[PDB]
Design a protein around this ligand. Structure first.
Ligand SMILES: Nc1ncnc2c1ncn2[C@@H]1O[C@H](COP(=O)(O)OP(=O)(O)OP(=O)(O)O)C[C@H]1O
Ligand SMILES: [Ca+2]
Length: 467
């Protein structure tokens, strides 16, 4: 009948001024690079066309190393799907593209990472080729004519790949390698969200706004314990179901209304979960004590449903809840004509709202040396936060998920609220090198350093943004 697990909050439709507020929203948003050009969209279209054709090509090549009847190798399909930002149609200028390669019976996960990997290496505009198959979802990353692409692979147990395939079917998962299942998950979730939303135009616009808000406001980063794309996509989709008729302007407002009242850890669900005979691991605190401890459950709607915000510590949950409420306050003003959309988008006073900080400085000798190391460090920051949260005297450890520059360097800043932390820090810096050694990764010239700084002393470290 309606969409979500609950009947909606209101069926109110917009009047002339709500349309006015929406236009102002679009106009506030343009200068931030949120909307791509005809040229850009088309470029993505052209690049993706090739990739697809390569995949259709390569799935034919492999199909002849196995000598199938030539009236079948022709029938053999192959397809590329997108998911994430780009597929949601809300990606920004410079956005990567998350893509999924779907092959038939005769193509093994082993093939994609050796032979098709060899295929890409040779193609004209492909740079930065690299496999990461140890990773949670096995991916091949590259840039194709300047588009960052994160290509992921799945092997289905069918003969062909109907150019109009449909991944939403749960029967597909039956008897599949957990590797193949996690690989289908991306599309499955993305496509599920689009289907669980009553209006796609208003969903997208609202999503674009909310994501901009999150970024500008310093709470966009799954890594560093905040939320990423799929999470914001899901929250905006839940809001859309509750107000199936609103304008984006209203939807951005209601979003803040809804998710500042929201009683955590009530989970955010987009559909009524069904059970299957499939018996896969699933988020469920009613059978998993580990799940009880997730602080801000935002649950993926495609089977098997998982939480997407495992990374959220208490501090980040607390920081975000405050931001939610700030959004509610500013949007109360905006929908009355008393404030402009820009006020919603102002950066927060991070470098003044705290009495103490931690400057997390990370250094390397060469460029390739830097990028890699910065990778490692950044993936470990959530640990320092963790240490700090277990500290008796600490009330909040707030990481700003934007690194800055200053030989190659990068720094992050944590803000702290109390009720001498050099050894919460040591154990962190120690832990980083220590684990860098475990992977035989730490090369000379790669330093990491963390100094506690009072506010009064901050300006010695504050970089270029001092404006
Ligand atoms: N918990 C999850 N469940 C299902 N899919 C996920 C999950 N986490 C990440 N993904 C998927 O992996 C891909 C890349 O992640 P991500 O880049 O954070 O999202 P996104 O929607 O593409 O937004 P951005 O590209 O960062 O602007 C696309 C996304 O749908
Ligand atoms: Ca992406």
């Amino acid at each position: 009948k309606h969409y979500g697990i609950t009947s909606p909050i209101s069926l109110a439709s917009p009047k002339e001024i709500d349309h006015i507020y929406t236009q102002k929203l679009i106009d506030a948003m343009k200068p931030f690079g949120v909307f791509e050009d005809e040229e850009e969209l088309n470029h993505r279209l052209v690049v993706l066309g090739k990739l697809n054709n390569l995949v259709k090509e390569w799935i034919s090549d492999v199909s002849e190393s196995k000598n199938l009847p030539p009236s079948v190798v022709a029938t053999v399909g192959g397809k590329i799907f997108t998911f994430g930002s780009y597929r949601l149609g809300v990606h920004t200028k410079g956005a990567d593209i998350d893509a999924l390669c779907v092959a038939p019976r005769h193509v093994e996960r082993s093939d994609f990472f050796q032979s098709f990997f060899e295929k890409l290496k040779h193609q004209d505009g492909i740079r930065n080729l690299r496999a990461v198959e140890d990773a949670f979802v096995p991916v091949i990353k590259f840039e194709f004519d300047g588009i960052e692409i994160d290509l992921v692979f799945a092997r289905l147990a069918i003969q062909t790949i109907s150019d109009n395939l449909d991944l939403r079917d749960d029967s597909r998962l039956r008897s599949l390698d957990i590797r193949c299942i996690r690989s289908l998950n991306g599309c499955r979730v993305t496509d599920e969200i689009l289907h669980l939303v009553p209006n796609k135009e208003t969903f997208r616009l609202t999503l674009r706004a909310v994501k901009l808000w999150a970024k500008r406001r310093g709470i966009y980063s799954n890594m560093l314990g905040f939320l990423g794309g799929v999470s914001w996509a899901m929250l905006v989709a839940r809001t859309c179901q509750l107000y199936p008729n609103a304008a984006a302007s209203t939807l951005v407002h209601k979003f803040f209304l809804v998710f500042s009242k929201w009683e955590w850890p009530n989970p955010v669900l987009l559909k009524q979960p069904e059970e299957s005979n499939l018996n896969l691991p699933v988020w469920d605190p009613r059978v998993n004590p580990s799940d009880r401890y997730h602080l801000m459950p935002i649950i993926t709607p495609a089977y098997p449903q998982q939480n997407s915000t495992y990374n959220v510590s208490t501090s980040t949950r607390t920081v975000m809840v405050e931001e939610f409420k700030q959004g509610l306050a500013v949007t109360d003003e905006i929908l009355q004509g008393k404030s402009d959309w820009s006020k919603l988008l102002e950066p927060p006073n991070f470098f003044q709202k705290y009495r103490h900080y931690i400057v997390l400085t990370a250094s390397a000798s060469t460029e390739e040396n830097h990028l890699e190391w910065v990778g490692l460090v950044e993936s470990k920051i959530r640990v320092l936060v963790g240490n700090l949260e277990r500290n008796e005297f600490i009330t909040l450890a707030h990481v700003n998920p934007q690194s800055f520059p200053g030989n190659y360097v990068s720094m992050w800043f944590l803000g702290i609220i109390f009720r001498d932390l050099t050894y919460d820090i040591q154990s962190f810096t120690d832990t980083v090198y220590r684990q860098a050694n475990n992977i035989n990764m730490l090369k000379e010239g790669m330093k990491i350093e963390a100094t506690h700084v009072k506010k009064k002393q901050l300006h010695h470290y504050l970089p270029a943004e001092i404006l």
